[PDB]
Amino acid sequence: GAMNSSNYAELFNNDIKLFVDDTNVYRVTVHKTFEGNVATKAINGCIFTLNPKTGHLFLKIIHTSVWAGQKRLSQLAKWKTAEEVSALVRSLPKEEQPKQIIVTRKAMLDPLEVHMLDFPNIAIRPTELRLPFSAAMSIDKLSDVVMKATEPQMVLFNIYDDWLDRISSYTAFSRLTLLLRALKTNEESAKMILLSDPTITIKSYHLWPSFTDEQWITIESQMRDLILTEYGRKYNV
Amino acid sequence: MNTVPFTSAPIEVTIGIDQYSFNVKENQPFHGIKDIPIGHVHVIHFQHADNSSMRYGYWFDCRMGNFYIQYDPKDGLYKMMEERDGAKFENIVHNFKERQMMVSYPKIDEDDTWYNLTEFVQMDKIRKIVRKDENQFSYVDSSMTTVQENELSDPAHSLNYTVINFKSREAIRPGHEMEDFLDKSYYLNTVMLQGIFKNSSNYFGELQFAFLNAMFFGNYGSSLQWHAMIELICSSATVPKHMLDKLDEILYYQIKTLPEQYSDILLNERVWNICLYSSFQKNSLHNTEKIMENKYPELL
Ligand SMILES: N[C@H](CC(=O)O)Cc1ccccc1F
C-alpha cells in the first residue's frame, strides 16, 4: 500500500524500486498580456525518477513542444509522466525493471496504473513521506540541462555522486533529502552553505561538492540549522 | 392470467411477488398467487419469519411452464418446481381457486411500475447470468457472489454478470490510455455494446436485473453491477441519444420504487454524485436527477 515512516528501510532493500516525482513536469511563468489579461508561458520541465538504493536518476526532460496545441495541461502532465515512466520501464531489461514504483503525489496513481496495466506484477504505490524532490531544479547541473534542452531528452545522473563508496544508501538518501529540503526552504542560503568554501569543488562528473566525511557532518549540521532557522522565521519562534 | 400455486405454507414467511409483499402465518391455509400478468418476467421471493437471514427467490416467466412452490423441510426453504402434467396442474389450480385459497396479484390498472422495471429483462438472459440449466426458472439469494467478486467461491452458485472494470486492458486501448480512462465511450460502445451485449436492450436488461436483485435480495454484488453499468454510460462522452433518454426513464422508476429506508445501503453516494453532477451526462438525466434531488437530497 502506501509508504510511510513505519516501512522506511524497505527503500534500501534489494527489491528494485523507483520514486517518481512529477512536480516539475509542467512548469509555467504567469504574466500579463498587452490587453491586461493573464497568460502562461510554459518552460522546460522534467520527470524525476530515482532509484533510492543506487542513486540512479532517470531525468526525462519535458520540452515545451509537448504541450503545443494541448488543453488541460496540468491533467495532461500526469499522463505524460505516466507514459514516459512506462516507456522507461519497457526500455529496461527485465532484470532491471522495478518491482515497485512509488509516486510522490497521489494524483499520479491512476495515470501510472493505467499505463502499467501490461505490468501487473509492478506495484504502484503512494507515500505518506513529504519528499522534497520538487527542489531537484535547485541543483545547478540538473536545472542547466533541462533549460538548455531543445528537444525531448533523457539524461542519466547518480544523485549520490560517489557517496555510496563511503556510506550506506539509507544514509545517502537521508543526506539527499536533507539537502533538497534545505534548497526547498531557502535556496539562496543552502547554495551559500554548499559553495561558501572555494577549496571544495564539484567534480565535473558530480552534482555536489567533494566534501570529506568530516566536512559532510559540518554541512549537514548547517543545513539542519538552516531548516530550523527558516522554520522560526516562518512561524516566529 | 397465470398462477403459481403452493402445496402449503408450513413455516411463517413474508412472500414477495414482484414489488408486492404479504405475510403468511405458520400452517396458514395459503395455496399461492393467482392473476399474475402474462407478458413479463416475475420474481417470487421469501424471507422466513424466524430467520430473516437469506432472502431468496425465483425468477420465472409463466409462459415457459407451469410452476409451483413447495416447502422442503430437509433443505428448509420454499422451492420452485415445474409440473410437467398440464392437466394435473390445471385441476390443482382450479380447486385452490374455487376454495379461494390464493392471493391475487394486486396490480392497479393505472400502474406500469413492473413493466417499467423489467422492460428489457428477458428470462433467456437471466438464465445465462444464473446458471442452472435443468430448470426454466432461476434462483437468487442475498449471499450469491458474482464472477467478478470471486476473481477478487463456488462457481456453480454465482451471478455471471458481465465484468466491468475501468482499469483493465479490456477498457483501455495501447496509445489511448488517457482518452479511454477519462472518456469511457470506447469501452461502452465498442467493447460492451457492439462486442459483448450486441445492443443496448441486452445492456439495459442486465442493468435492470442487477438492480432488482439488489433491491429484493440485498445482493451486494448486484448493487455493484448496477452502479458499474450506470457509471459506464455516464462516464462516456459519446452515447446514443436514445440510450440516454431510455436510461433516464429506467433509473427514474428504479429510484421511485426503492424503499426509502433502504436508500443508505442500495445507493452509492460517489457514483450518483459523479453521474448527476460531474460526468459527461450530468445534464442528460433530467427525470432521474429530479427524483433523486427530491427524494434523497441527503445522498447529494
Ligand atoms: N498521446 C496520448 C494519447 C492518450 O493516451 O490519450 C495523450 C497524451 C498524453 C501526454 C501528452 C500528450 C498527449 F497527447
DSSP, residue by residue, B136-176: SSEEEETTPPBHHHHH---GGG-B-PPP--TTSGGG--TT-
| Helices marked H in chain B | 86-98, 113-118, 123-129, 147-151, 177-182, 185, 200-217, 220-234, 241-257, 263-266, 269-273, 286-295
Has residue A2 been placed in a domain?
A: no
Pair A88, A182 in one domain: no
Taking the centre of ligand 1 as the mean of its atom positions, its distance from the CA of residue A79, in whole angstroms, is: 7
Between strands B32-36 and B42-48, the pairing is unpaired
Between strands B66-72 and B32-36, the pairing is unpaired
> Scanning the structure block, which residue is given the C-alpha cell 438464465?
B127
**Stretch (H or E) spanning A90:** helix A73-91
Q: State the virtual CA torsion across B13, B14, B16, B19 in degrees, nearest 10.
A: 180
Instruction: For residue A120, give Cα distances in angstroms to A49, A113, B29.
Output: 20, 9, 60
Q: Last residue of some domain: A145, A163, A181? A: A163
A73 at B interface, C-beta within 8 A: no
**Could A114 and B168 be called an inter-chain contact, meaning their C-beta atoms sit closer than 8 Å?**
no
Method of structure determination: X-ray
Instruction: For residue A104, give Cα distances in angstroms to A28, A74, B157, B195.
Output: 20, 16, 43, 38
Instruction: For residue B268, give Cα distances in angstroms to A47, B86, B211, B299.
Output: 37, 46, 12, 8
Q: Last residue of some domain: A163, A182, A202? A: A163
Residues touching ligand 1 (Cβ under 6 Å) are: A 66, 70, 76, 79-80, 83; B 175-179
C-alpha cell read off for A154: 533523457
Pair A118, A171 in one domain: no
Q: What is the Cα–Cα distance from B139 to B132, expressed in whole angstroms?
A: 8
C-alpha cell read off for A229: 532557522
Has residue A3 been placed in a domain?
A: no
What is the DSSP-derived secondary structure letter of residue B133? Answer: T
Pair A176, A232 in one domain: yes
- Cα B169–chain centre separation: 29
Closest CA–CA distance from residue B219 to any residue of chain A (Å): 29
Residue nearest to atom 4 of ligand 1 (CA): B176
A117 at B interface, C-beta within 8 A: yes
What is the DSSP-derived secondary structure letter of residue A145? Answer: H
**Could A114 and B167 be called an inter-chain contact, meaning their C-beta atoms sit closer than 8 Å?**
yes
**Could B177 and A83 be called an inter-chain contact, meaning their C-beta atoms sit closer than 8 Å?**
yes
**Could B181 and A117 be called an inter-chain contact, meaning their C-beta atoms sit closer than 8 Å?**
no
CA-based nearest residue to A88, from A121, A126, A61, A125: A61
Has residue A172 been placed in a domain?
A: yes
- Cα A113–chain centre separation: 20
Overall resolution, Å: 1.6
CB atoms inside a 10 Å sphere around CB B213: 32
Contact (CB, 8 A) for B62 and B36: yes
- Total domains, chain A: 2
> Scanning the structure block, which residue is given the C-alpha cell 422492460?
B119
Residue type, B53: S
Q: Last residue of some domain: A132, A148, A163? A: A163
Pair A159, A225 in one domain: no
Q: What is the Cα–Cα distance from A237 to B204, expressed in whole angstroms?
A: 64
Domain extent for B229 = 116-299
Helix (H, G, I), strand (E, B) or coil at A14: coil
Has residue A119 been placed in a domain?
A: yes
Cβ-Cβ contacts under 8 Å for B92 (sequence gap 6 or more): B5, B68, B83
Assign residue A47 a region (left: φ > 0; alpha: ψ between -120 and 50; beta: otherwise).
beta
Contact (CB, 8 A) for A181 and A132: yes
Closest CA–CA distance from residue A51 to any residue of chain B (Å): 25
Contact (CB, 8 A) for A94 and A116: no
**Stretch (H or E) spanning A43:** strand A38-43
Question: CATH number, domain at A234?
Answer: 1.20.80.40
Nearest-5° Cα angle at B269, B266 to B271 = 95
Contact (CB, 8 A) for B269 and B246: no
Q: Which atom of ligand 1 is nearest to the CA of B182?
A: 6
Pair A29, A146 in one domain: yes
Closest CA–CA distance from residue A76 to any residue of chain B (Å): 8
Pair A223, A138 in one domain: no
Q: What is the Cα–Cα distance from B201 to A56, expressed in whole angstroms?
A: 55
Cβ-Cβ contacts under 8 Å for A96 (sequence gap 6 or more): A16
Domain extent for A44 = 9-163
Please tell me the number of Cα atoms within 13 Å of B91 on its side-chain side: 4
Q: Which residue of A has its CA nearest to B166?
A: A114
- φ/ψ of residue B43, rounded to 5: -135, 130
Chain A contact probe: residue of B152, B172, B181, B183 with most A CBs at under 10 A: B181
Question: CATH number, domain at A56?
Answer: 3.30.420.230
Pair A185, A141 in one domain: no
